[model samples]
Target chain A: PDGREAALFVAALAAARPVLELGVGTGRVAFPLADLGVEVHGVESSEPMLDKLREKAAAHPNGNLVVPVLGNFAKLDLGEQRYSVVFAAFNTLFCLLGQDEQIDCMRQARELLEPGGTFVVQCLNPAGQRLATGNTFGTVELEDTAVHLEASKHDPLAQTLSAHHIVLSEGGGIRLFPYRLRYAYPAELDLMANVAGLELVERHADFERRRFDASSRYHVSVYRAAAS
Target chain B: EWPGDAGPPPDGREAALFVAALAAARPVLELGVGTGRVAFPLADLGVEVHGVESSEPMLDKLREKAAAHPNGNLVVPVLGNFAKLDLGEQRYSVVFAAFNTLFCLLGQDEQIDCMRQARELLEPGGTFVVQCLNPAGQRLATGNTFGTVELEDTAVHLEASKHDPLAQTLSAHHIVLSEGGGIRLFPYRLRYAYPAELDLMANVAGLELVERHADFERRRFDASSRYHVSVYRAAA
Candidate 1:
């Protein structure tokens, strides 16, 4: 039953070799990559998340695979180090605001990579469907403490959206996480990549290498530095 | 060592900002220019500054800082105390001192000396400003003793402990975590007085009390405040 999905995940993982993940939370994909013996180092901003990863590592018998460096991705300084493949999954790139910040993130990634290293970014493809129908959506995710309700509201003119999160704990403690971000389109992203010394290699609608069309849910784009 | 030397030295940024607001281009006099924190920065803003200091060690540090500056015309350091500066009739467009250095005079007569020297060196209707920590409220609230560590890194730790009263004096104990694995101490004793007392001293020296600000931000003087910047002028 799990064969097909596991096979697809492993295939996608193999395609992106020596991946460096930014904002890698709880080693979701990172732990799997480390299990598969692919060289992986992650950069995460939150100290709590890093602490969780360290606890997870301590639980494992052979736990020294993932190295999580604490830093803000926007102002990251990795010294004279270089990587072969850089990837940020789970729509983390959208955390950057405005065109300049987004472009600078890509530029820093380009500077970190070798001449032929690939940069993959996965983001939500803003289709007119949500905005065409009143600009609001809701979802729920179960957590250790309680059920969480998440609602998203979008502004079409500004291309901005706010995601509101409410965690209703069973023990009577409520937590709120709210964030706003400006959405980026495929063409605009291509121009940003060009300005960052990288070329758009391919655009995939899903992890299965499908084409990105108007109706696509996710935009998984691959970019590579221009060969010197 | 003064109460601030254990922490970051004062750069001339605030003094330069004050100078710019005065709209004056001529030379200025700085009283109690400890470590040249304010004087050097004022000079960097393209204004000539003549500074007077009492402590030889602090003056040595100021010399070192001034020697590194490329614009040699900006600063002239003299080894004279603020209360007894023989500045002659070398008039200045502005006279400024900061950080309760005025309080060091200990008595009414010595503080009057500072005001007199400031008036003697000021051009007609020129500005004279003095900044002092409001010890009256501080002593009332905290009972005159406060201590805080400025830095506590693995290599070095430095702490500044201060004791003051509502009346007229403060003693500071500066302790540094030495590189040789022991603590080294530097103590300083300073004096202070009330705002009304200072105003009277200015009046006696023939300098009118033009205005009194609560802080560098020029807020109104309040009892709970921690700063009082008194602006005076030579009687025309």
Candidate 2:
């Protein structure tokens, strides 16, 4: 839902111009923007994810418009090339390890944007989810073929949540995927944006310009670089 | 005189010090003195102990326990709410509320009111002590969620809580699942205060913070502390 929402929002805002995306896994959002005649440049760190995006882009009609760059977004350098909009969708900012790394990513994005270009970020709202103190298992999803369980531990002082995903298949196969994330509150993100020299322009509950309130599950924040 | 066998008795070095601190002044007042947990022990140490309790059942249990003790007369259990009780021009050297009883008031105004009342019943520069769990520690341990506090073969106790950051309140229900196909809920709502906030509450009541301890042993209070034992003195 976020991928489709971001593609629609960026296409309308970019006006068939070039846009840059961070963590463009499988070109989910980038390909859609390219299909709308918008030039899409993506930065992806994982080779396997880039391979999947390349495989799909090879057969698409607007495949040539989707350009993939292999690098970490935290310290990315795009040289003199700039974009009308540089965005990170689907909580990719949280994937960075710590606050410093997140700030680094924001600074890099600010540098990659034109003087008046927009920098959009979409991340989950940390409120409303009750985190237990110790380890507890909760079912993430149940499907016809597999059941996914998430076992998580919370560290409130550090604002970190660590989890292990356990997937059980009907054919008696099991798999595990471990993850850790350091979540930041909205106020903290604003401070990071300030440190990166970008001013907040708009904040919405979602991509559709809905009002962001206490009950919002996610936030879509739009920032702009200081015009020279 | 609360029933001695009704529930677990208060047994610790903390109780010993409570009696010792007040023995120098001879007479002491305890607020929300449920079942004479600390009052009885203070009387045993030969200090005259007067308690104010809201619940008649708890007071009855205290009276029952007092009747059986040789120095039962030393323990006087008054039936009234601590916040509005009028004990009639009586003054004591030490007035105290223990075990987070101050949190039961559920509002800052009521807590301050209780503190003022306690101060009124104290002599010049009398000590007023309060004991409560550290709110920061508990909030960090459980962040607006349910967790198993106790688990056993025949019963399981789960604590479900919601925290209101603005009001500094943690409301919880302790759900107990028993083996006999029965369920019970114990509801608790606490308007917790940090150590600094409590100092303000004392100052508002014309009292000065004298000392703060992490525990009854007079250990220094620090960031990692789970509970606080604070001592304040009434204005001279």
Candidate 3:
């Protein structure tokens, strides 16, 4: 389930050939999309993460189908090349720290897409219950021998959540990951998209095309260029 | 103007906890003891409870309630601002401010001065307990400046809040809309303090934090706690 459904979902909606993926960490979605014969161009900030994608592409027969661009997606410049589908998956949109940067990301995505093309973004819905009950600490993943725990602190005035991740292994090894996210409500996100001159065309609860409702935990929002 | 009815009882839990704490050390002093909400319950438990209030109308209500109580003689109402009140030379075992009363002082210097005065009225190693909202969770959850706290056909209560992060204060206007087109506004301000900041204020007042809990139930305080019941004791 490592983005296979996501690649197929996007592929079904993509109009033309070349697709641009923002924050494609390790070709999890890109390689599968490339296997479906759609050319994929990925932009990532981390060189080590890109290296893993490169290693995987070098081992595969259709490796050249995935082109990895090393840069931050917030300010990515793709010259004059336009894509049929420009997308960011797995809550990567939250990685942008502030409203300005998130709006800039939308603008960049809009710039990278061809006329009549689509821009898709996937992010978890902000949970009011979690924020209300002060349940900021919970397990993100669990396994027989490994566990991933997330501890979060929320600043309501700033609309920011700082999360620290702890991964523990049965062999007594632990790894820590710290992340800060400025979360936006769906209405706020739509406003940003509007400011970027994009109009929301579709919003689904998941890749399988479920209707988005109040209880939906995640959303896959699709936008089209307003001028187009 | 105080909203709501004569206010509910101590619900037995709050009264029980205060009674147990008071057993350790005899006369209790409550700052801003509005209408004997907690003081009367303590008096019922056989402990003498005195109060200092700045408002005459509030003290009048307390006097009326105290007159009808079985242990009414144990209740004493003193009229003065707690920040600079001189309540004689009688020091009590516990000095307390409940329901975010400390935040009403508006300034850090005034708050620190209140703590100093409370310390002055305590016996050696006496406890000063404060109960205040945590000020972290609900604000973040609702990003709007205005919200409806309660809405009904007969009455609608709305709250409009403005937060000054730099000043660590929250100012609000509580608007009540009655069915007969009557509108009432209650404006209040709170110079809120974090737990660490309160600890610093205690240190400045020659006191130390003895215990901090999420509630009177003695639950452990954590990131998600909405309110805290903190105890600071004067140096023995």
Superposed on all Cα atoms, the candidates' RMSDs to the truth, in angstroms, are 15.2, 12.5, 19.8
- For residues A126-162, write the lDDT of model 3, one tens digit per residue: 7522464222455789999999865555666677766
Please, what is the whole-model Cα lDDT of each candidate in the order they appear?
0.70, 0.78, 0.78
Write candidate 3's Cα lDDT for B1-236 as tens digits: 23332123233348436544755537888887887777777777777878888989989989998899887778899898878866788888888888788999998899999999989888876788888778664343322275544434355455677887778878888766554446678888888888788889989998898888887778888878877888888864
Q: Chain B TM-score of all predictions, in order? A: 0.83, 0.89, 0.89
Q: Clashing residue pairs, candidate 2?
A: B1-B62, B1-B63, B2-B61, B2-B62, B3-B61
Better of 1 and 2 by TM-score: 2
What order do you get sorting by lDDT, best first? 3, 2, 1
In Å, residue A145's CA in model 3 sits off its true spot by 1.8
When summed lDDT is taken over every stretch of 10 residues in candidate 1 chain A, the lowest stretch is: A1-10
Error of 2 at A169 (Å): 1.7
What interface RMSD does every candidate have?
A: 21.1, 9.4, 22.2
Clashing residue pairs in all predictions, respectively, total: 1, 5, 1
Say which prediction, candidate 1 or candidate 2, comes out ahead on DockQ.
2
Q: Tell me how each candidate scores on DockQ against the true complex.
A: 0.02, 0.02, 0.01
Model 1, A1-228: lDDT tens digits are 222332244335445455577877787766766666655678988899999988987775434767778887777988887777777776788887677888888988898887667787878888723344223334468877687654455656766766555555666554556677777888888889999988987888865677888888777788888645
Candidate 3: chain B TM-score equals 0.89
Lowest-lDDT window of 10 residues in candidate 1 chain B?
B150-159
